[PDB]
Amino acid sequence: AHGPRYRVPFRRRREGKTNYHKRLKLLKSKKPRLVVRKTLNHHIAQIVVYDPKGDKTLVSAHTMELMRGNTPSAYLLGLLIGYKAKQAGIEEAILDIGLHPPTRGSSIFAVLKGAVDAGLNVPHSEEIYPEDYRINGEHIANYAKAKLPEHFEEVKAKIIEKFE
Amino acid sequence: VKKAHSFRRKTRGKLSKHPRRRGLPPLTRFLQEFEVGQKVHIVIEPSYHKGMPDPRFHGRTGTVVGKRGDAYIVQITDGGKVKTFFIHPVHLRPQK
Amino acid sequence: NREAILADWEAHPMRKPRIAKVTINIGVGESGERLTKAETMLEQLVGQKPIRRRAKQTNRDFGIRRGEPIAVKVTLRGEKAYQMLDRLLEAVDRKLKASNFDEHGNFCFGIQEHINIPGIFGMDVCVTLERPGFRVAKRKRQRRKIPTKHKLTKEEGIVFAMEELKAKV
Amino acid sequence: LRPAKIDRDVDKPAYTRREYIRGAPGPKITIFDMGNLSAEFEYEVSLHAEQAMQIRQNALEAIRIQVNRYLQKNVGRSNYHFKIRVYPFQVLRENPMNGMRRPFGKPIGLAARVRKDQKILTVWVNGQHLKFALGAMHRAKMKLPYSAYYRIYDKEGNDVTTKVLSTM
RNA sequence: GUUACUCCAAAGGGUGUCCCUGGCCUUAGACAGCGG
RNA sequence: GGUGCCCUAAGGUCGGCUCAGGCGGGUCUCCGCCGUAGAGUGCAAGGGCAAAAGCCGGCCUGACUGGACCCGUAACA
RNA sequence: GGUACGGCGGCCAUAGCGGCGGGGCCACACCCGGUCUCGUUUCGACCCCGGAAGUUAAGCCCGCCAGCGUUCCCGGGUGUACUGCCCUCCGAGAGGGGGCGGGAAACCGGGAACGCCGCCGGCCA
């Protein structure tokens, strides 16, 4: 810094991780939040609620425990969290995506699709959702000519038949 | 030359903000909770222009008696008259 | 002093420079109130549109009114820039003067209206270099500044330009 | 011009803001330093006020001229350093008559405000011109609206007025 | 001077007198007178 | 010291981006950098404001209807 | 139980600027390319999409440093400046004084200080 009258921003802003205006608009809703985060090779999905000493995380999910970074895996992650959280007993939520911008055709909204299909109530619109020929994988099974829906489908069956 | 009272009259220090706050307050204030009979302080945040009462009553202490909307109803004593305000909880602060 | 980029390659290319991009402009400005046809020229030259650049505060000589396009600029990267440079360096006289370089590893040709590699242009040509991992001072997420142990100077840039085509003064 | 008892006293707010005072006058005294400015003299000789005063620039310029002439003819320039420490910021007011209808003074002059035991002037001098320094101080003291007293400071800023007076 | 306040003079000065302080002198000091 | 107005945007929201000034290059609008805001805000002063309340755009007309309660002008009264 | 890993946060400079030494299975990054989801008043440079050939140089992580800025303590400055109540105290007056109670700011010297606290994981066994 360079003396008094210099204003040293909040830490999580300084780092570049959190928007406090959006955070406020979301907290004003007293419903639970569904945090969806994306990286180069993985996809994270948590359920959070507010406490004054620090947001408490109820349920979580990770693509690693899944396998035991694309739209198919995003959908399956959504499925996983939707079956976990409705078991926990919280049949309502709202979406938080953070500093990712909203674009129709993104694995974040595929996570939304999965969490809905798994049966969890989350307000949305049926137009940002990617198309199922990107969901299943036909995009990569088409790039193949210049991962298989076999595996996608029997994995979907695994998840559902285990979280029935 | 006389001059009526108005909202922002002689508010150059009372509604000035320290040069090191300068922005949004922490979010542990917009979401404050209060009960009935709870005593509260009236302390104004100059950045939020919604639900802000007359600065005449900056620094006074009242009691909560209800809720309307996201606002709280507050009673203060002004001489021997009772006065009722509708205030947003970022402008308030609990005793002790 | 070639030991500098010697060390560049030594450590490994993570610390190696390269060309971030190139740009070309009408510098002294010749449209005034018009939208000239060097517009069409530059497109014939390269093969992608030129970018108008409107006026500013009412001036005295160059753009004496606001809002009126006066100039043109364009941007090249990838291989177009490498290629377009390979003619241009040969076109200018050899042993380039570091006295037009930038104190941080950049430069911008003064020279005006010379035609090479196959009538009026007045022109200014600027280059921008950077090591690879500069992404982070641009990207939203976790943006921050760049230290000095990863930035550039005059010398490394000079030796990198000397690497192909022209030698220096 | 009008007597100085009207402007001696300090019982009145400060009036120093020219970006609000319309018609504020301009200074007469424009020289505050004299002699050898780059210098390493031995003895320092300063007037202190005995009580709060309000000194006009007329008086300051009178003091300047008198003292500087005296020391130029009795000491020489390379051997003394003379400084005035205080600038006139206080604007003085006079009522233009109508009588006492709309009374609020229009500006006439300037003054320097000085508090108790404050320095006003200073003559830096060697040890073989102290007589002249003190004569200068007498001449200056004679031209002020209230009283004053002098000391003699050493480098290291210490009072030696007694040890020096007793021996000269 | 013999005035709590109501109703009462200064800057500048004083071998007038009573006191504090610090240097230099002193068994020949500081004035006088006798001469160099 | 100012007001007796102006604005279909200078009004609502959504998204993206950052200012004045200077240094270093090129000639008489182009690249890079430092920059807590030293700019701007429809109009005075004060206050507020930086992933913005500023600039760039896209879609709209909450500048609506029917009604309650409370603060000020006008402290206490 | 272990980690020279991570996401969401609270207090919002005792956390900031600057400087240095070290580290990289799992993870975050920088990277190659982009037809399509998306678009750049012109460029997969920015943003979005699929992978990893390469490395730790940068960001991230561990450790330290008192050059600048901030905050707290110990002595001085100093019971100084200013001040509430009372006074048949001083003073020609301006303004000062006594008693009973409160009480700084600058500056000097010396210390500490280069962030603390929550919830949930992931992987090694």
- Distance CA(D162)–CA(D152), nearest Å, equals 8
The one-letter amino acid at D162? T
Helix (H), strand (E) at residue B80: none
Tell me how far the alpha carbon of residue A13 is from its chain's centroid.
21
Tell me how far the alpha carbon of residue C9 is from its chain's centroid.
24
| Locus of tokens 């991992």 | C133
Question: Which of chain B's residues 27-66 bind strand F, using a 7 Å CB cutoff?
Answer: 46-49, 53-54, 56
Cβ of C137 near strand F (distance < 7 A): yes
Contact flag C143-A16 (C-beta cutoff 8 Å) = yes
Scored b (16 or more CB within 10 A) or e, B31-67 reads eeeeeeeeebebebbeeeeebbbebebbebebebeee
Shortest CA distance to A80 belongs to which of A111, A109, A121, A108? A111
Q: Which nucleotide is nearest to A73 (CA to C1')?
A: G50
Q: Which nucleotide is nearest to D144 (CA to C1')?
A: E11
Tell me how far the alpha carbon of residue C158 is from its chain's centroid.
14
The one-letter amino acid at D132? F
**How far is A17 from chain C, CA to nearest CA, in Å?**
6
Shortest CA distance to B30 belongs to which of B96, B95, B88? B88
- Cβ contacts of B73 within 8 Å, gap of 6 or more: B64, B65, B66, B67, B84, B85, B86
Local structure of D136: helix, strand or coil: helix
CA of C159 to C1' of G55 (A): 23
Chains A and B in direct contact, meaning 3 or more beta-carbon pairs closer than 8 angstroms: yes
Which tokens is B67 given?
């809720």
The one-letter amino acid at C27? G
Tell which of C138, C139, C141, C145 to mutate to test the A interface (max A CBs under 10 Å): C141
CA of D129 to C1' of E36 (A): 38
Shortest CA distance to C166 belongs to which of C56, C71, C113, C91? C91
**Where does residue D105 fall: left (phi above 0), alpha (psi -120 to 50 degrees), or beta otherwise?**
beta
Contact flag C141-A15 (C-beta cutoff 8 Å) = no
Cβ of B26 near strand F (distance < 7 A): no
Do residues B72 and B87 lie in contact, with contact meaning Cβ atoms separated by under 8 Å?
A: yes
Length of chain D: 168
Shortest CA distance to B92 belongs to which of B70, B77, B80, B79? B70
DSSP state of A130: -
Do residues A80 and A87 lie in contact, with contact meaning Cβ atoms separated by under 8 Å?
A: no
Do residues D144 and D48 lie in contact, with contact meaning Cβ atoms separated by under 8 Å?
A: no
Cross-strand pairs, D153: D44, D159
Do residues D150 and D85 lie in contact, with contact meaning Cβ atoms separated by under 8 Å?
A: no
DSSP state of C96: B
Chain C contact for A16, CB < 8 A?
yes
- Distance CA(A107)–CA(A63), nearest Å, equals 13
Shortest CA distance to D108 belongs to which of D81, D135, D127, D88? D88
Chain C contact for A9, CB < 8 A?
no
DSSP-assigned letters across all residues of D21-41: -TT----S----EEE-SS---
Do residues A138 and A71 lie in contact, with contact meaning Cβ atoms separated by under 8 Å?
A: no
DSSP state of D148: E
Q: Which residues of chain A does C144 touch, with a Cβ-Cβ cutoff of 8 Å?
A: 16
User: How many DSSP H helices and E strands does chain D contain?
Assistant: 3, 9
DSSP state of D19: T
Residues of B with CB under 8 A from a CB of A: 19-24, 27-28, 30-31
Do residues C73 and C51 lie in contact, with contact meaning Cβ atoms separated by under 8 Å?
A: yes
- Distance CA(C101)–CA(C152), nearest Å, equals 12
Do residues D121 and D46 lie in contact, with contact meaning Cβ atoms separated by under 8 Å?
A: yes
Chains A and C in direct contact, meaning 3 or more beta-carbon pairs closer than 8 angstroms: yes
Contact flag C141-A16 (C-beta cutoff 8 Å) = yes
- Distance CA(B22)–CA(C72), nearest Å, equals 41
CB pairs under 8 A between A and C: 10
List, in sequence order, the alpha helices (H) in C1-116: 3-11, 38-45, 80-91
What's B23-75 look like in SS3?
A: CCCCCCCCCCCCCCCCEEEECCCCCCCCCCCCHHHCCCEEEEEEEECCEEEEE
Nearest CA in chain A to C141: A16
Tell which of A28, A31, A49 to mutate to test the B interface (max B CBs under 10 Å): A28
Which tokens is C134 given?
């500069």
CA of A46 to C1' of G2 (A): 25
Strand D158-159 with A33-38, pairing: unpaired
Cross-strand pairs, B39: B63
| Locus of tokens 């204030």 | B29
Shortest CA distance to D53 belongs to which of D96, D1, D111, D14? D111
Q: Which residues of chain B does A28 touch, with a Cβ-Cβ cutoff of 8 Å?
A: 30-31
**Triad D93, D98, D103: Cα angle to 5°:** 35
Do residues B27 and A22 lie in contact, with contact meaning Cβ atoms separated by under 8 Å?
A: no
The one-letter amino acid at C3? E
**Triad B15, B20, B23: Cα angle to 5°:** 70
Tell me how far the alpha carbon of residue A38 is from its chain's centroid.
8
Other Cβ atoms less than 10 A from the Cβ of B83: the count is 15
Do residues D124 and D36 lie in contact, with contact meaning Cβ atoms separated by under 8 Å?
A: no
Tell which of B20, B32, B88 to mutate to test the A interface (max A CBs under 10 Å): B20
End-to-end CA distance of chain A: 57
- Distance CA(D132)–CA(D67), nearest Å, equals 10
**Strand E protein footprint, C-beta under 7 A:** D 141-142, 147, 162, 166-167
Q: What is the resolution of this structure in A?
A: 3.0
Do residues A82 and A46 lie in contact, with contact meaning Cβ atoms separated by under 8 Å?
A: no
**How far is C148 from chain A, CA to nearest CA, in Å?**
19
Do residues A43 and A123 lie in contact, with contact meaning Cβ atoms separated by under 8 Å?
A: no
Give strand E nucleotides closer than 7 A to any protein Cβ: 11-12, 22-23
Tell me how far the alpha carbon of residue D96 is from its chain's centroid.
29
